[PDB]
Amino acid sequence: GPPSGKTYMGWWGHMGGPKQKGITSYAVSPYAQKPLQGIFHNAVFNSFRRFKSQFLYVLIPAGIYWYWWKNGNEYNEFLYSKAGREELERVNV
Amino acid sequence: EVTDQLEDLREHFKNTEEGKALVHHYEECAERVKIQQQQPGYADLEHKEDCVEEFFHLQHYLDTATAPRLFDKLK
Amino acid sequence: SFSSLYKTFFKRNAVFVGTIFAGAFVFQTVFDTAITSWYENHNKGKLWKDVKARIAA
Amino acid sequence: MTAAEHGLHAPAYAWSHNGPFETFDHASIRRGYQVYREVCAACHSLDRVAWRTLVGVSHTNEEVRNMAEEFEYDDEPDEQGNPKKRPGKLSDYIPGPYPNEQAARAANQGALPPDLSLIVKARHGGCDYIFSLLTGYPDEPPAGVALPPGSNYNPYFPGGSIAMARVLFDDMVEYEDGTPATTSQMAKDVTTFLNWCAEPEHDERKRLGLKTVIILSSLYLLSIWVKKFKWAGIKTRKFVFNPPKPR
């Protein structure tokens, strides 16, 4: 088979990153550990940290688009009622 | 002997304080129409007022009161 | 002992796989029977069998 | 649009088949068929329901045999090719009151009564809409409305005017089990029967959903433990940096 072009990923042994020198890693066998260590602690304290950092980027846009929706629903209901017949003719016509 | 359970239940909640308010408001609409249908010009005036909205407000109230209780009187 | 338990069921994959299959056969029949029994008992008096015998009195 | 042309929203009743562990009340199904045959069947059809599907649900095998044998069905032509007729059998379908649509509109002031095999599933509201429509005919139309001739008033019908008149009146059917047949009792029974016509798999579907959810929930919990066990070495892993000497 012919060769291919130049990519930004290789395989095992020639992955294509910088030369590494001075870093050491340690690990323990999974058969000698407790898989469920700290689940109760993380479910409350870690969960509170994650929520507190991102909840402002989601709720503010959501509340803006929900207030817009409710204000448009009430206006339409008032327009097609008996008390809104003076406005329905002056807008839709 | 046994009559319509829904009819007997609807006549009960129509006599409560909240019910008598919605009943009294519907009758005020009927009189405004019962006298406006006997004038020269009502045969053709394009916009003819009705009392559907007042009927809807009262009918909705009896439905919330009677729906949770009706099926316990049946079989 | 825990050594004898490993040596009988967990050392050879053939015994491990055969045990899983034989445990799935037993679970299959028992799980079905216990589910209909609870389901029928929760709806006593509403089944055709219940009403058929009542009108047969 | 206005609330008049929308139609009044039906309330919520406490049906006995509501709930993840609940089935149909088969005594109301049996009673509901009697209401259909004596009141509904004069103008509505059930052509998607076969005679055999009633056996073991609300009637015995012998009862359904005698019910179907009261109608005449077309047979194969004889040796000379002339047409023939035969009594019904368990493999047939429930016949309707009219031969074609022109006949139906002629007997109903030009309006067509719909088929009632999927009517519960084809309306927004389900059982709550059928019950409210059958018991929601006021003795008087609200002051102001002008009904076209030959039409009745019902607040639950979109638009207000409906071509079907009130058909349920107290003590018009004599139940065999002694239940007092009132307007509300008959409207409740015929709605349960029509719901079984639309969803004849309701009882066995809910029993299969119990087994499926129980088994699938266990597997989801077991796979969380297995994933955390296989990832234990990577989750607890340490790195130390000691800068190399210049060379």
Add this chain to the structure above:
Amino acid sequence: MAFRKSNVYLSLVNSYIIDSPQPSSINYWWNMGSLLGLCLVIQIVTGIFMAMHYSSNIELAFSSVEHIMRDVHNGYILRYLHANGASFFFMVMFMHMAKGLYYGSYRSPRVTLWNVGVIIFILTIATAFLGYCCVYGQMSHWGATVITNLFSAIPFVGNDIVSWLWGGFSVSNPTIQRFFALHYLVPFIIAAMVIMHLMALHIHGSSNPLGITGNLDRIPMHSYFIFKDLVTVFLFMLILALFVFYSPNTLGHPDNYIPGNPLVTPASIVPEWYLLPFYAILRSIPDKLLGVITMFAAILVLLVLPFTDRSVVRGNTFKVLSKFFFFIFVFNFVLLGQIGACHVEVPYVLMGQIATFIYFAYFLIIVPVISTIENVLFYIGRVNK
């Protein structure tokens, strides 16, 4: 070498799902791709077994679906699995496309991978539309009428294209048998374009939530992400089983249980829920030709993204303003669907016209302007000049 690396067929399996080097930092949002593969298998298998009992004649199409529910053993399970499975197909795909929009997966090295995904999105929309028409209810017949009538706005040749598509003068028997044959074929084109999707991903690999290179720390696919994909696979079937056995008609329309009638308009006509956002964009332009063109633009503007992003960092993880305006676009999309299921009333007409403007202004105005501002803030916030 090992037999899994030397064999001609096993080496393609080993290189893709066993020894593939994956970054160690990818979270559960990187699990939607494997879920979309399971959705496609579910739809093909249930469709084939249902097609053994189906008739495409316009006089028998509706009754053949009712025959499957009642007479075929476990036939209602197949039908509710196929109908609800298609709804879950678009749920995952919407989240799959928003993951790559948040993490900048469309940027320079992987533009070809992004472009193939847009083609898969177009084909899947067509496949779902064609299968909805095959039921032949009141919403499928009248939905097909409005959709196919928009091609008549093309100049000169517009009216002839509609007749060729219909096979006649309106939506009739030639149309319904036409659509079932195409509904059988297009899913196989999707399966062939999914293989091209994986080929373009293998050249540079996946990205990571941090947005930087992952060549310094990799773990093999097998036994690390095989079991992490199994976690969301079991959760996926649990939620699907809830909708199939306990609420099978919550995501549908009740008017599709009324057999198709060309003589009675079914009041409001709307498509399925996942096509509603694009239905509202079409209705916002008071012109048939211009309004139709804008509807396919909404899918083609996704190709402009790799060139209007002027940021030197890939992703929104460390960007303050880009994170805020990303969720404005997301909830703008949800509001567009709500307008699509509404009537043509006084407030809702202007609401959908402004929300249409925000949809297009996000790619062409908001992203270029915001990304240049953040580049300066990163610079002047640490340089001592």
